[PDB]
Design an enzyme around this catalytic site. Structure first.
Site, PDB file in Angstrom:
ATOM      1  N   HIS A 167       2.927   6.734  11.396  1.00  0.00           N
ATOM      2  CA  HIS A 167       2.118   6.772  10.148  1.00  0.00           C
ATOM      3  C   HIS A 167       1.064   7.881  10.193  1.00  0.00           C
ATOM      4  O   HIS A 167       0.392   8.031   9.171  1.00  0.00           O
ATOM      5  CB  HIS A 167       1.529   5.411   9.760  1.00  0.00           C
ATOM      6  CG  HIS A 167       0.496   4.881  10.695  1.00  0.00           C
ATOM      7  ND1 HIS A 167       0.832   4.066  11.753  1.00  0.00           N
ATOM      8  CD2 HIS A 167      -0.842   5.066  10.752  1.00  0.00           C
ATOM      9  CE1 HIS A 167      -0.265   3.735  12.410  1.00  0.00           C
ATOM     10  NE2 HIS A 167      -1.310   4.333  11.818  1.00  0.00           N
ATOM     11  N   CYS A 179      -5.870   3.998  16.334  1.00  0.00           N
ATOM     12  CA  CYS A 179      -4.385   4.044  16.373  1.00  0.00           C
ATOM     13  C   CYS A 179      -3.876   5.041  17.424  1.00  0.00           C
ATOM     14  O   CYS A 179      -4.476   6.123  17.582  1.00  0.00           O
ATOM     15  CB  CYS A 179      -3.843   4.377  14.998  1.00  0.00           C
ATOM     16  SG  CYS A 179      -3.960   2.947  13.896  1.00  0.00           S
ATOM     17  N   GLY A 203      -9.476   4.895  13.632  1.00  0.00           N
ATOM     18  CA  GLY A 203      -9.447   5.987  14.607  1.00  0.00           C
ATOM     19  C   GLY A 203      -8.833   5.525  15.904  1.00  0.00           C
ATOM     20  O   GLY A 203      -8.534   6.402  16.729  1.00  0.00           O
TER      21      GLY A 203
END
Ligand code: NA
Lengths: 304, 307
Positions: free
Chosen positions: B42, B146, B144
């Site tokens: 993503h 991920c 932030g």
């Protein structure tokens, strides 16, 4: 909605590169290798029968550089000098540590938090977050062979070493020195009877954690009541909480601003929790009031 | 008597693999092993197309020039890109000189691992957590985080088992293994998803009661035993996992070390579930803790190290 506020340690890599094994006679413990010096607890020179009242000056009469074996991983470091400073030895070695981080030695105060890299035989085993308690102990996890393990904070690229591990008190809490070799609290490095003071609760930290709980959507303990600093302190005393100072109220300002809950309204909530308990409820997944997050820890974890 | 703490693995071997990946305005973390950077797919999404992104279609419109990889102060050139399930593999021009020995492993529910929480490719903290029976984890992840990874260490080898992707409305977390497959039924789109029942990991609670006895907390010990059959009827009532013969087998070494039979400890747990702690604590908790495995207890109480 974020609700995962957890006890979190600093990444340990910068400290892992500094850990070595120090052996004197049959005693093996950990040392900290910075530049060309290794720091370790001075009781590395003790013998099993002379732990009750060692005379460290007398014990050093019979010690040469070659009586100290230092091993970084499987690399032997030659000791070319040794001195005693307070309750640590400084072993001068022939090789400067190429993994020395930017570092400082700092003295922490009760209530302040730091990460511990628990080590055995100069090898890292695990990392966890501690606080310097009011009685100058820490609730660590330390076995035989953990002496010389260090506590630290990381600020920018700078490692601030604050703790080196020396001893376990009978209630299974831990005592040690700063990296200058001065004990936290009244403790001495001898096996004479010593007891941790009555443990008291770090009130400014509990209030920071109740602010964390509000930021993380736990609001059930908030009430309409206000209190005074004096009246709150009468309750703190009864429940073996540390006094809350106006300086603490100032330190909690930013969290009261962020949440819009006045410090003395959060004090009223804490008063109601101490008097009435939690009525089978939890806060941030605890049934106890947690006191090992500083105001600074809450801000850092909740907003980075 | 002695202390027992939620302890993470030392993180150094992992910190040397963390990079920053930006695609358009989106910046998150990636794992740099040899000449491959692994990150959540993503990274390629835009704000207005998060409900049901078409990853294949979004990704054909991406070139290597759309992926900016930075390791510290150092821009890495992307020279290849593929999708593997819910992760990207970005081939880079430089093999990571700090690449540790490693495997990719998929953990089972009730197993524990360390999380290195990272922001902008910079490691910020380390903590221990468990794969819940519902295949969520109770992490601490902000915007932030991920691409932050979970791992175990055995000897000198890092076993990577988790990569962070999402936060569910109750504030628990979902993510993938390093093959890019989610734990549980979660999907990397902003369609309504909910965690399933959160059940207590019974074998872990029993491990933690053994840890308490080793560390001198004995008050919950009674002269009673139970049958496994009678214990499990009580477990069901309190949303505890059934205790199986495999669990009894895994608890065997702590039973032997303490000389307290597994079904004796079961009798202590049944009493704690039925009656509470009556204002006492076990290892400084007023709740029954379920995120220590039997292996975690032995490791901590025996002082096992890594390199
Ligand atoms: Na049975």
């Amino acid at each position: 909605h974020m609700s995962g506020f957890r006890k979190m340690a600093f990444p340990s890599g910068k400290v892992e590169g500094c850990m070595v094994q120090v052996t004197c006679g049959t005693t093996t413990l950990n040392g900290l290798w910075l530049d060309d010096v290794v720091y370790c607890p001075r009781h590395v020179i003790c013998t099993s029968e002379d732990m009750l009242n060692p005379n460290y000056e007398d014990l050093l009469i019979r010690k040469s550089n070659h009586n100290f074996l230092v091993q970084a991983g499987n690399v032997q470091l030659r000791v070319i000098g040794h001195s005693m400073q307070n309750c640590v030895l400084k072993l001068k070695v022939d090789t400067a540590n190429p993994k020395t981080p930017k570092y400082k030695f700092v003295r922490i105060q009760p209530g302040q938090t730091f990460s511990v890299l628990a080590c055995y035989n100069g090898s890292p085993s695990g990392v966890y977050q501690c606080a310097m308690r009011p009685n100058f102990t820490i609730k660590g996890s330390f076995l035989n062979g953990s002496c010389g393990s260090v506590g630290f904070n990381i600020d920018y690229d700078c490692v601030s070493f604050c703790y080196m591990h020396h001893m376990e008190l009978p209630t299974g809490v831990h005592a040690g020195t700063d990296l200058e070799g001065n004990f936290y609290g009244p403790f001495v490095d001898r096996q004479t009877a010593q007891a941790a003071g009555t443990d008291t609760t770090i009130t400014v930290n509990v209030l920071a954690w109740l602010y964390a709980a509000v930021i993380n959507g736990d609001r059930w303990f908030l009430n309409r009541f206000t209190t005074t600093l004096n009246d709150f302190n009468l309750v703190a005393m009864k429940y073996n909480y540390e006094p809350l100072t106006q300086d603490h109220v100032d330190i909690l300002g930013p969290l009261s601003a962020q949440t819009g809950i006045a410090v003395l309204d959060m004090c009223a909530s804490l008063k109601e929790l101490l008097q009435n308990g939690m009525n089978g409820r939890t806060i941030l997944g605890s049934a106890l009031l947690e006191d090992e997050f500083t105001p600074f820890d809450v801000v850092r974890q909740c907003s980075g």
